[PDB]
Symmetry: C5
């Protein structure tokens, strides 16, 4: 049997937005999926999962895939973080989703996440001239040419790495702001879409190291009329894919009670800076939904309304949202209302 | 079974000159030609097919070829743009040509397009020294050597890419201005010549990104005696290839009525800057045709006149002309006169 | 017959800290393991193993592995240094360890060494800006991304080289200080852990040459709150892996008599700069041990205390400790105390 | 069936020294040698082969070989230039040589050309320091090492390309001036040597583009005691290869009548700058010949005088001579004189 | 039939120190070793083998090997230089050695040469900072790491090149001065060691060209306490390999009569700058020999004295010595004395 490299990847307890951590384990064993991979540990003081004298943390594999960069038999191992007593660590946001995922498995929730990000070279946006601004927006989005496209080599390398890892990438595109890009993950189950997006994020930062650039998931990287970075989330249940009434209930459910504030205060840090009335999308403090409405909080695509079935698009989440969090909330809110409505 | 990349390419509604757009779709299916390729959509506001609050657009594949850059099983997909009701979008200029292509199919129109372009590095022409001018024109055209040739690495990469894509390239050459180049598409039927030229343009910008340079189809990139960039168009019907009388009819039809202004006002933005009396070609406001006359609006090549059959060359179109448009006008004007004349 | 390259590597007599030396021998003989390798010699005057007019030294191979850098049939040969009468040279610290390894072979001592190091470009730390300081520590440790990760290309290259060399590397990680890294060697027998670590160090310096950077094993490369570089050593015997009783015995033995100073004055040059009271760990001048205490001289991990068996961690050795010396001392102190207690 | 690239190369009508021009034709046909290769055309106004209103020029293939740079099935096509009536264009210097070649085919004339050139980076000689002079000549000629050798990478690539092209190269060497080089073509018949040399020149400029340097055939690139660039020509007939009497006849024919100025005024532009009394060879205004005399206009090598048979070397032609011209003149003068003398 | 490149390499008549010259010959023949290779010629005026009006020189192949740089079937041809009458040219030092080799062939003389050299980037030593000095000597010799090792990539390409050439390289190491290196050739017969060392020298300069650095065999490249470059020579005869009495006769013969001055004045230019009293070795004006004496002119290694048989080491020759000269002088002096002594 063989010796291989295992990259253990986890999420820390940094505030307001948590960060990825990883280290390499050299494993000398007979290959098997996930279940044969050892739990591991690290020092919490260094990752804000203590920054104190009593937290030592345990790494528990939850997802694994091939390491496309290292190649060969090497693998990536996404972990959840546990306390020494094997209970979920307070930073752990996966465990809550797993519970809700299981609770609502009958409805078969499916997600697509459109993850945006912006390239930087140091403090400078990669698409910006030093000490200045590029031409106004219009030619960057879905663009071509050196004048309007920045970081394509990175984006292509990242896309190839994600596919080699087996992640469900449906597309990529260049965004409205120069040096701003998007990739779409899904359609997938709530734990699976969330796990893959974190791994895909890890691949983006990591791939970009070789090109000596940085990527940021900051929602408003440059102040002004320059475009924000979102993480639009597409969501449906079997009933929603079957009929239009479920589609309306889900959209209505998000507008009920404290749910608008409940989601928005968990949809990523600095959300007030990105969600303004004037550009995309709607203000963070009011909820709306509509057909083909890019100004609404939630959009129902024109095809969905025509077909009387489909999915809905939540345009509120920031590019820096935790996928474990956004998926949990939408499943908790929408699926609960659908059960009550009998639209299951 | 396989996963492959599809780059969906389209033309936007930008004024005065429309621009290429592209995004990547990841497709998991059994390969089949074009008809099996899914229709797609995009948000028009970002592409001047709204820049408003109401436009959603549909992508309909019309042409496909291998992606020479990605390689393997990856492909390029040229699309036309439709409204949600599947009617042509106002930006769509292919549909009018497709209609005219059908109307005159018995005459069998064929086109060759000589597409010129100029390399730039930022705001600087690639062949120009920073802050200055190179030696006057004369040694650049069909030249050799580092002193007189700029961007050959890009040009060669681009040509190989076109051929791998299966495009009908007949030749390439270095042009009169330093860092100015030409490639020839044809001979082809009107839709095919127009589609392939658009894909070849897209390949040019995209190929040049890797070399950190820009290409421009601006008709007069440098003011003065420096050469303009045209897209000279060669055109014929079966009757023109058979006999000389149809050639004179074709040449005369372009000078009748409002046809000179009708063509010239669709022959690209900034045509007044390129079409001056003094150098190439003829002034934009007067129509002339002649045998072997490079100062004329339309030239009859000396071989065509010797053989009593051949084609004609329209020297008026700018390098920034829409191929869908220039082909449509020539088919409309020339083929209509030939039908009346009985020369079909 | 065939020719292959052999890199003869040794440790000099430099003070306070000894240095690696190497040269290449071209061998035309039939390959066989270690025993067929010729003894060799060198000039001591140049290596601080004379600095006089009478010392000629003999190189005798003790370990060999593939040269991962040269590749093919080429090999690395680690040697010990002997006088011309074939007795150990005064610089030789392996020979003391070899006697003790045999004397206590029944206890089956095993070591793991966590070897930290810092990248430099000239006098500047690789993770530091010129003339300045980076953001405070926190995001570097086990990090990802260009803002926080420096020297990863070297680290992957070094790790792949160690594994190709067949060395027992258990893991690597990015450390608390920017441009600081760690690799873990073990678990291994005392001479074997010591031999492989020296070869791994040589591989680090040599691999880093290709990237035009430097590595240092200096214990406090930057003054202040910036992290020191250590070589934490994990140690156990069969009795220790069997029971908790040996662990207390092992931990107390290190605190008895002159053993704290006996060890500490051999635990690397400049130890007073790294082992300060205020942060990790304990002052270089006081010995303490405790369960899960990162501030102690010796820590008993929580898993070890829970299982009533395991190993102990000596947090005192500097990154510049000689592994032959630190391993010898721990085996000498702990195994002697364990024998007396009957706990073997 | 297959598609391949054909690079049509020709010589223009520029004065005083004509220049190479080239463009690419994409061919989709079954390969066959030269005769199946299409005639082509170009615009003369841009190449000093019109600068007028009546010249359209015809490209007629006369020689072809593989394209060593493009590789595969791609080829280089050397053409001669014709008027539209298929007669030789005034710039065409090949046709005069072809008449004369056939006229004297019984004597079997053969030529070898030692073609010198100098590398430049912009206005700076590649072997020169910026703003200054290198050490005086002596260590450059046939030298080795970075201090004395400049452009070898270009030189090796050019040689490998020529051999891949099938050209008759006998040798290369580094010349007396730094960054000055030589290659030898031959021994060959007059049309072939001239054709191959032109292709070898074209390959030199073209290869050098990739290294971002220039090559010049200027006879005196740097003024002063720095060495000039010549094109020494080796010439013989069957009678000359047979006997010494023909050699004397050949050597004497060049000194008769107006033949010295007749040749010299066609031996390249700026010949007065290179051919001075003081160094090589003899002054441009006097004819001399001698055995082994490098200061003479024409040299009889010592082996030729020893063997009583051989060839002669004309040391007068500049590096910028047209090979079609020098070969025509030497054949015309010597072969005519040999005929009159009866030594054929 | 096939074509291969032959690089003809020779030594010039430059004073005080001769230089390598080379040119390329293109050969079209059936391959065979040495005997099938054509003699060639060159112009002496350019190479200090005339600097007059009467020398044309002949190249006669004496040694050949594969060209490791060109690879494939291409070869290096080391030549000796002859006058046109086929007698040895005055610059030729090989011919003298060939005579003594035959005269003393019965004694079976054998040589090893340790060839030192220093890297330069322009006028600056490669290991020196611009405008200053690096740390004092001690860590460079047999060193590792970017701080102390300079030019290793060149050294490695060169070593691999020499082995591919089939040259007898026994080892390489880094020397006391930064950017100073050594390779050892031998043990071999006098003509073979001398021929291989010249080819190895030629390969070093040539390999170093690709890295854009220079190598020098200057004996004292930086004035002061910085180390000189020598060419230590190991020498033995069959009798010396058999017994110690022969060893003593050889060491004494070198101290007799005019032998110390005869050798020293032929041991390379600038020997007085390297051979000073203070340091290594002995002053150029005094002869001494001793066992293990690094300060003696000639050293008898300790193994030789222990075993009562072996070789001797002449530490006097400069790195810029002609191997043909040092080997001849050593054979003449020692072997002559051994014949008289009856120790043959
Ligand atoms: Na990050
Ligand atoms: Na030299």
């Amino acid at each position: 049997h063989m010796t291989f490299k295992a990259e253990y990847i986890w999420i820390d307890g940094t505030e307001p937005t948590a960060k990825l951590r990883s280290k390499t384990k050299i494993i000398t064993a007979a290959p098997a999926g996930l279940d044969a991979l050892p739990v591991w540990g690290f020092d919490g003081s260094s990752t804000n999962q203590a920054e104190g004298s009593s937290s030592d943390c345990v790494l528990k594999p939850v997802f694994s895939c091939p390491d496309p960069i290292r190649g060969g038999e090497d693998i990536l191992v996404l972990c959840e973080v546990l306390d020494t007593d094997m209970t979920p660590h307070p930073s752990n946001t996966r465990a809550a989703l797993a519970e809700l995922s299981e609770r609502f498995a009958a409805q078969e929730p499916v997600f697509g996440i459109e993850q945006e990000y912006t390239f930087f070279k140091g403090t400078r946006p990669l698409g910006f001239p030093e000490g200045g601004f590029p031409a106004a927006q219009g030619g960057y989005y879905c663009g071509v040419g050196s004048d309007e496209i920045f970081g394509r080599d990175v984006v292509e390398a990242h896309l190839e790495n994600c596919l080699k890892a087996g992640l469900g990438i449906s597309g990529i595109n260049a965004e409205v702001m120069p040096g701003q890009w998007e990739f779409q993950v899904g359609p997938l189950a709530p734990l699976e879409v969330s796990d893959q997006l974190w791994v895909a994020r890890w691949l983006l930062y990591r791939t970009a190291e070789d090109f000596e650039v940085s990527a940021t998931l900051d929602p408003k990287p440059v102040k002004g009329d320059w475009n924000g970075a979102g993480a639009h989330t597409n969501f449906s249940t079997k009933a929603m894919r079957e009929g239009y009434d479920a589609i309306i209930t889900a959209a209505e459910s998000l507008g009920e009670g404290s749910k608008p504030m409940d989601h928005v205060k968990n949809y990523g840090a600095g959300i007030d800076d990105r969600l303004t009335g004037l550009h995309e999308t709607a203000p963070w403090n009011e909820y709306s939904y509509g057909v083909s409405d890019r100004g609404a909080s939630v959009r129902i695509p024109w095809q969905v309304e025509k077909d009387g079935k489909g999915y809905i698009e939540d345009r509120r989440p920031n590019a820096n949202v935790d996928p474990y969090v956004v998926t949990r909330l939408l499943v908790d809110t929408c699926c609960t209302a659908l059960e009550k409505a009998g639209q299951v």
